[PDB]
Amino acid sequence: MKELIRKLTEAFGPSGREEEVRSIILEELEGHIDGHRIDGLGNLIVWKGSGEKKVILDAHIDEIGVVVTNVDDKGFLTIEPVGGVSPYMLLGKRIRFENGTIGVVGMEGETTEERQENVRKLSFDKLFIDIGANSREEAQKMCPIGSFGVYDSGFVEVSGKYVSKAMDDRIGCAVIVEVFKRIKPAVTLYGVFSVQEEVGLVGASVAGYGVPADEAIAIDVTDSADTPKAIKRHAMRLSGGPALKVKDRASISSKRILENLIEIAEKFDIKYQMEVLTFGGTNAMGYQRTREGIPSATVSIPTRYVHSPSEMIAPDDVEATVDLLIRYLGA
Amino acid sequence: MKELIRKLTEAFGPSGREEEVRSIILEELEGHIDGHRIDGLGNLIVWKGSGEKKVILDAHIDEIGVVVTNVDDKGFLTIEPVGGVSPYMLLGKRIRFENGTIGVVGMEGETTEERQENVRKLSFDKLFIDIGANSREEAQKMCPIGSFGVYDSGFVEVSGKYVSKAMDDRIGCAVIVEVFKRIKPAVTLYGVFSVQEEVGLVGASVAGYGVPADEAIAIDVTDSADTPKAIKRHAMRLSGGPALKVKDRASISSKRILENLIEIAEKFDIKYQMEVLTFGGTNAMGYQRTREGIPSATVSIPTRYVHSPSEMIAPDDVEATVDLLIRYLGA
Amino acid sequence: MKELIRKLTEAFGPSGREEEVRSIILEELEGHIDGHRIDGLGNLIVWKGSGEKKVILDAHIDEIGVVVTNVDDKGFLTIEPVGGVSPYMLLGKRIRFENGTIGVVGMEGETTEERQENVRKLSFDKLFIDIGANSREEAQKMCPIGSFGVYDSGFVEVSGKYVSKAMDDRIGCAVIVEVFKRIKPAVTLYGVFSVQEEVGLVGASVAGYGVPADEAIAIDVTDSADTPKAIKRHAMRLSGGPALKVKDRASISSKRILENLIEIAEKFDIKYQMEVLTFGGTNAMGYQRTREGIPSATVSIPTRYVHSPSEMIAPDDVEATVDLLIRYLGA
Ligand SMILES: [Co+2]
Ligand SMILES: [Co+2]
Ligand SMILES: [Co+2]
Ligand SMILES: [O-]
Ligand SMILES: [Zn+2]
Ligand SMILES: [Zn+2]
Ligand SMILES: [Zn+2]
């Protein structure tokens, strides 16, 4: 699963421009699905099996990123975040744009005091991107207004942990791909690789409309609060297993689905942990609100450094999540 | 109505765990409804009558509460709010958990100065719950992560006012139950006792999907701004009658429905008042946004001390609201 | 001892209005004392035994509470604390008055911003009580200026701990009652159930005047600093035994009395702990200052959440305190 995670996390797919990730997922799934379709927003919907119970597994294919909002007379670019990227994570960083351009992020400040003030209350209004242009006309040919970019950052193994950009949520995508590669479903299994989660759960608010699901399980990251002075009210930690989300700020998981998964994990000796997240949301909200309501839950991968260019997971948690879903859904 | 209000407000039903309330409502409605169903999120839908016009009356069955998010080595619990609970309403209060456990809420602060600082900017990060455990393992067996709780508070009559927890929205549940118990409907009357209003209108955003309603009327509490130095821009007061909601922050009521109700009130000499609420929302928003749009309004019970353990209503307003709905919807 | 603690902690007795508590104590002591008197301030003084050494055991019968200071045109009350009640412990709470009236505590604030300002610097000037009255005349008939109240809160066992209002100092009263029920005194034992400790040690500043005591031991609560981020400079804890008070802000205990009790505890294998308290005072100061000076000490019950409606003690500490006093004073 290491090379699948490397390929998915390094692929380009900020919210709204997820094509490249979608096509990689399809190539990994061919031979392991019975059919697929792509809807009008770009959600990829795959299926395997013909059981009477119908289940969605959802992971989002978009990552946070930036979009160019303006260009000045010297060729520098101004940007707007795409999803929840902190300007502090961009200082001194490089951005890779959809067309392959690399840009360097710099900060304004006409005096040393101004620079101190700006970093104290950093905002995207004080950042700019340098793509090497020498004029506005040159920059507009290179990377015009509306161009999307992501962190220029890739995958590395760090003493047994995996680190990359976009673990949120290419790690959930990898989980679902591996489930389809291995499972003999007892259900009709739908895999939804949904768009634009980071800008408001857009894809998953419609992807279930045309899927006759009885249940929906979102796979996403959660806060691994096991670093120095981490968030004290979060219990989730690396190597504690899949985290069964009781609640975050966007949904309360179905009690029945959580109980089913707890029963599966205890029966098959899969380590797991319970999750309450005090901020944030996942695509389970979109399925709950679809049509007459699809009962939904989230199973989370504990992740350190979420929304940074160096998100970190423990591979044993990812393998245990795959095992849990196969045991819950497979024949 | 008094014993119905006592039973409903004292029942256990924080958002996501409303089963106890749903079951009491079904028992009270036996002999007064033509049929019912429970959907996949837990919304209870009941119906009576067969008229051409189809009307939903909605009340939410959830109350605000707390959920356990972590446990420390000495057996103390940390919590997260479920809905809009202020940490100031929890200090020195007791919490009743689903499994019957009682816990005492305490506040951190290693010096007298830290305690003063903490109460000035109180947050859930500075609260803990003591359930009498002496270790992490004892507490995990007693009240683990993901356990839900509500105020340990019950019903009392205060010189002719009624005071309890969860008037929001067990008083609206009581209104609708009493309408079904009394009414000979001229409409097809659907009663929706919906889940998870306090965590984002979840239940009512789907309960209408499978109900062919021409109108929906939510019954919920509103701010009785008749206490000392109450919110000056709110006009609503106890004993002013049902409050007809023109607007709050989640919906504008249908003008036609409001006009219909005003006509009924004037024809039958029912006291009523108009409402504009400068914060907050109700399930009318969910029905308005269902399918091609269900025209919706809210009729509110004036309530003092909303989201405290001592919410207060005037029984005459409750009786007038029942009268208004029976006159509007009955033969 | 459980039912005695339940009855004493639930009884009504704010400072100045302790009659009901005094009457319960006198009834419990019937058959176990040789005589008693009630002095002009209301202190109850009892005695048993005939030995040469005369020892006072003191506990105060008052608890903190509130008193009505004014009534407005709409029947709402304003209050003043009786003793050290924090306004933060009153928000959303109910008050039980001497005549049985229940009132609900609310807070002023004409805008959402004013409400936020008010809770950041809460004072009794921003609180009011609602007793259900609709006019000043009605409220003055129900609960006029000068009416006293206490928390509407009662006793509950929480996994082997006892929780109630007024552990301070009904637990000390229970200790001394149980000593008198069991002891065969080697001293002449005087029991003083003093009034008005919480408003300045008033009762115990005079109850010793007419008692020819050689020693005085006050029994009162102290801070059990074993909760999350408790007061770091307090060592006392639940289940560490009676706490022998070296000093607090009102007195330094007699070194000879503390040494006597330590010798007893070691001889009879009774668990105990030493106390230094960085704020607060007890009735030991009143006996120390009586006439030519009565050597005095305090033995404290570790208590969590002091001056809240949910004070918490460990029953084993209370039993050990009774044992200690019987071994020290009895045949
Ligand atoms: Co994200
Ligand atoms: Co509410
Ligand atoms: Co005190
Ligand atoms: O996310
Ligand atoms: Zn995500
Ligand atoms: Zn409500
Ligand atoms: Zn005391």
PDB file of C-alpha atoms and ligand atoms in Angstrom, chain A residues 60 168-169 197-198 220, ligand 5:
ATOM      1  CA  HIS A  60     -12.770  12.923  -0.828  1.00  0.00           C
ATOM      2  CA  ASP A 168      -6.256  14.429   4.066  1.00  0.00           C
ATOM      3  CA  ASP A 169      -7.852  12.594   2.278  1.00  0.00           C
ATOM      4  CA  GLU A 197     -15.050  18.349   0.420  1.00  0.00           C
ATOM      5  CA  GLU A 198     -12.632  21.058   1.592  1.00  0.00           C
ATOM      6  CA  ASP A 220     -11.350  10.781   6.443  1.00  0.00           C
TER       7      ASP A 220
HETATM    8 ZN    ZN D   5     -10.694  15.351   4.844  1.00  0.00          ZN
END
